[PDB]
Structures are given as structure tokens and as C-alpha cells.
Amino acid sequence: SNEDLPISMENPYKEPLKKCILCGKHVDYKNVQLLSQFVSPFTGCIYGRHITGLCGKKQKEITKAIKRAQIMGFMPVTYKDPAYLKDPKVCNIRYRE
């Protein structure tokens, strides 16, 4: 017949599924430096997933890890640890502007 007819295939141009910054990495409640990167530097409020950019699974992990660290003397509650104020900025939030 005709060899130019379209064939059935999966999309070859399909880009790989996007992954969060913490995809494939363990989250531990003792890893305070990682946890402090997802709380406000003035109030210590836990940022939402619209700010952190994490997926559903890691957002739950960070929230559970932060809550465990706060009660076990690893993470401050009312503020963000000053020693970790110079970490790379990964949350899409701006206060002064």
C-alpha cells in the first residue's frame, strides 16, 4: 500500500517529567540547614508549595521534618537560624520588593 501513512507511537519529543530540587534525596529532621531553607527568615512560618516549588511528596516530608525538629531542639520556631541566613535562595518570595 502506502508507506507514508502515520504510525502509532509514543511522543518521541516528550520532555522528561520535571522533578523538585529534593527529588531522590533524603530529608532528615536533623538536617536543620536544609529545613531552614523553607521557612520565612522573619517569622519562621513554613512556606507553601507555591513558594518552595516542591512536589506533593517532598512538601509533606519537609513539613513533617520541620515539626519534628522544632520539638526536639534542632530547629528554632519563631525565627530562622541566623547561621543559615546565607544559604542559597530557593524559595520564590521577595519581601523588600
Binding site: 520565612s40 522573619f42 517569622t43 519562621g44 512560618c45 528554632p76 520556631v77 519563631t78 525565627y79 541566623p82 518570595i93 519581601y95 523588600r96
Partner: protein
């Protein structure tokens, strides 16, 4: 009461411009949601009323974000008429 003081929600005044610093402090509290939390905590909001308010705000957010997306999507069409007279 048991945390270090003068760290949380503290803004340093630059060159004596107190007006800018206070607005910066006010905006930070608003962005984190502290300002709205305090006002609703003045009088107790019953659980039935809170869920109705939250559902209204969540529905409001969906409509606000969807309408905003369409406005930005159609903003490129705000140019002048390219076929004037037709």
C-alpha cells in the same frame, strides 16, 4: 518567651528612614499572613464559620488566579486596530 529576642520580625532602620522600614515590616507580616491571622483571632471564629470562610477564600483564589491568567493571555491583543475601517 523562650526564644532569642530581637531576631524574629525585626527590621533594621536604614539611614533614619523609619517610614520605609515600617512599611517593610508591615509587608513582611502581610505576606506571611500574620496580619490577617491577628484580626480573625480578636473574636473566636466557630469551626463551622471558619470552614465557610476558608472555602470562600479558596474559591476566590481560584477565580482570581484564573481571571488574572486570561487578562495576561489576552493583553497582547490590546494593541491598535490593524484593520481600521473593516
Amino acid at each position: 518567651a523562650k526564644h532569642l529576642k530581637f531576631i524574629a520580625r525585626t527590621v533594621m532602620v536604614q539611614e533614619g528612614n523609619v517610614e520605609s522600614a515600617y512599611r517593610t515590616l508591615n509587608r513582611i507580616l502581610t505576606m506571611d499572613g500574620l496580619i490577617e491571622d491577628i484580626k480573625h483571632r480578636r473574636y473566636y471564629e466557630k469551626p463551622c464559620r471558619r470552614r465557610q470562610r476558608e472555602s470562600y477564600e479558596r474559591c476566590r483564589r481560584i477565580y482570581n488566579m484564573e481571571m488574572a491568567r486570561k487578562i495576561n493571555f489576552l493583553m497582547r491583543k490590546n494593541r491598535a486596530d490593524p484593520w481600521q475601517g473593516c
